[PDB]
Amino acid sequence: GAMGSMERASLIQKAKLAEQAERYEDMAAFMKGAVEKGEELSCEERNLLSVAYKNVVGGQRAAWRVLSSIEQKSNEEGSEEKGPEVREYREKVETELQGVCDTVLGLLDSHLIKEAGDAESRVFYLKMKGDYYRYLAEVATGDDKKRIIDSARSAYQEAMDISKKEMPPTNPIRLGLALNFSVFHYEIANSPEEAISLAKTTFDEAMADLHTLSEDSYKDSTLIMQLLRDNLTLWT
């Protein structure tokens, strides 16, 4: 722990500064340090953790896609052999991405999930666990790909079961979980019909609960409902 000597509060403060500066690798390192202090995370702190690693891995994923696309073209019929470099560099980025995912999954397993008892924390962390196994699945090709997919599915499913029992249908964590699990079905599990059914049912059940919300809660829930609709429009 290179952050072991820094105060928990100072790590959280610096994570917020790193966010303002769009220094997401730093932000993630600060929040990893905060998690490793061993205390549970508040709502704000959980979101700082998630924002940081989502941005880091999101950039890695975008780079991996560029390189994979180049690599596939180099392997078409008619391409001039360019040697091992495209594969090597795609592998380099892939290994770094896998490392970040393993780091996040390790934090969730030691010991964020096991201490998370409230729905808003436990569902949040199990969603993250599904998300980072989903990112591992995006690059997986070996003996382990099915198991990685099933690990993502299992985490999402436990999160879904808790969210349906303990949260209203407009809860933004519940909505974002369903959005992402629907994408898992479409893009990872080769289950587009499940993806579409989940997005549509989630949208409709949220619609019917909007009347209970304040203006600020309404704005948050309708934002993610619009993402559900966006995906449905892409898929139908």
Binding site: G176, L179, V183, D230
Partner: peptide, 5 residues
Amino acid sequence: FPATV
């Protein structure tokens, strides 16, 4: 790509 959050 589809939207995730």
